[PDB]
Amino acid sequence: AMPLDQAIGLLVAIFHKYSGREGDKHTLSKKELKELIQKELTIGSKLQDAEIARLMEDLDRNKDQEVNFQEYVTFLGALALIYNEALKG
Amino acid sequence: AMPLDQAIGLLVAIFHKYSGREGDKHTLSKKELKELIQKELTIGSKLQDAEIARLMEDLDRNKDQEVNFQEYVTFLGALALIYNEALKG
Numbered sequence A, B: 001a002m003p004l005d006q007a008i009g010l011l012v013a014i015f016h017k018y019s020g021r022e023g024d025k026h027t028l029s030k031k032e033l034k035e036l037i038q039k040e041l042t043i044g045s046k047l048q049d050a051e052i053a054r055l056m057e058d059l060d061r062n063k064d065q066e067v068n069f070q071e072y073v074t075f076l077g078a079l080a081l082i083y084n085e086a087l088k089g
Helices: A003-019 A030-040 A050-061 A069-083 B003-019 B030-040 B050-061 B069-083
Strands: A027-029 A066-068 B027-029 B066-068
Touching: A003 A027, A003 A030, A003 A069, A003 B003, A003 B030, A003 B069, A027 A030, A030 A050, A030 A066, A030 A069, A030 B003, A050 A069, A066 A069, A069 B003, A069 B069, B003 B027, B003 B030, B003 B069, B027 B030, B030 B050, B030 B066, B030 B069, B050 B069, B066 B069
Parallel strands: none
Antiparallel strands: A027 A066, B027 B066
């Protein structure tokens, strides 16, 4: 697949890895999303960064709320802005 | 990189391929986003699908509006729901 098709296919696959764990495969809880981020990204050196720590706290404060695919993708965009190196500056 | 880190890195790279063409590297126009989708995804067989055609029309109707990285990622999530096979059902 072209690079962007590859990217989308990976986003979908990782969503379904966690959304399939309980109930509806169309959603995952914010508790589960926090677990997904900590397991699927090499983020362990950055979890105490001021902005990333607030995103993780917000997931724990809203842990039982569900997230659909669109909201998961939006959230990954928010996290990339404060996590991915190429988005610095 | 882990799969999701790979996915994010590709999203960022394709954004910057187009956002760097004019002006600010932090945004791209909706005209440019339409070009990005048509060139970076194997979507040519699906452009007349009822839902995809409306997303492409909306980009052309708002062609001069700018899009930041967060809005680009959100948009890719919207498109994936109506384009990616694994999101059917």
